[PDB]
Ligand binder design. Structure first.
Ligand SMILES: [Mg+2]
Length: 142
């Protein structure tokens, strides 16, 4: 599997879902969380996965980019595959148990997808970040 190379960005919006101001606001939140906790959460948006499963892509991007390694200790990839209408939340092994499949799925189904169907990409991703941070803190309360 070949994924995109490391961007150096908290938000890599290759589907161009977000305005620059929306990217900068998400990026500030993500960077601040990483600074305080050493947990690196990144957002990647892609026009298409070209037939690669979202799970496989998210895991390879976390590996290739070293998400949650190097300067950081734990990692999350939020991968948005626009053509396939998939959102895959991938956590590093360190965070095993913090976001089970049902909690990730409920973030996608109930938090992200209804916002995305209205064109509210910033709100859906912002709320997903907040839910991920709450879950990583042991404080997610659906
Ligand atoms: Mg953009």
């Amino acid at each position: 599997i070949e994924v995109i190379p490391p961007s150096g960005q908290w938000v890599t919006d290759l589907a161009d879902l977000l305005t620059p101001a929306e990217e900068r606001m998400l990026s500030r939140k993500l960077a601040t969380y990483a600074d305080t906790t050493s947990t690196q959460i990144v957002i990647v948006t892609l026009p298409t996965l070209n037939g690669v499963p979202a799970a496989d892509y998210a895991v390879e991007l976390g590996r290739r980019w070293g998400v949650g390694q190097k300067e950081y200790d734990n990692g999350v990839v939020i991968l948005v595959a626009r053509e396939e209408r998939e959102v895959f939340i991938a956590t590093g092994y360190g965070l095993e148990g913090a976001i089970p499949d049902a909690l990730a799925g409920r973030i996608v189904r109930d938090i992200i997808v209804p916002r995305f169907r209205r064109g509210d990409f910033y709100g859906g991703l912002s709320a997903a970040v907040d839910a991920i941070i709450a879950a990583a803190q042991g404080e997610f309360q659906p």
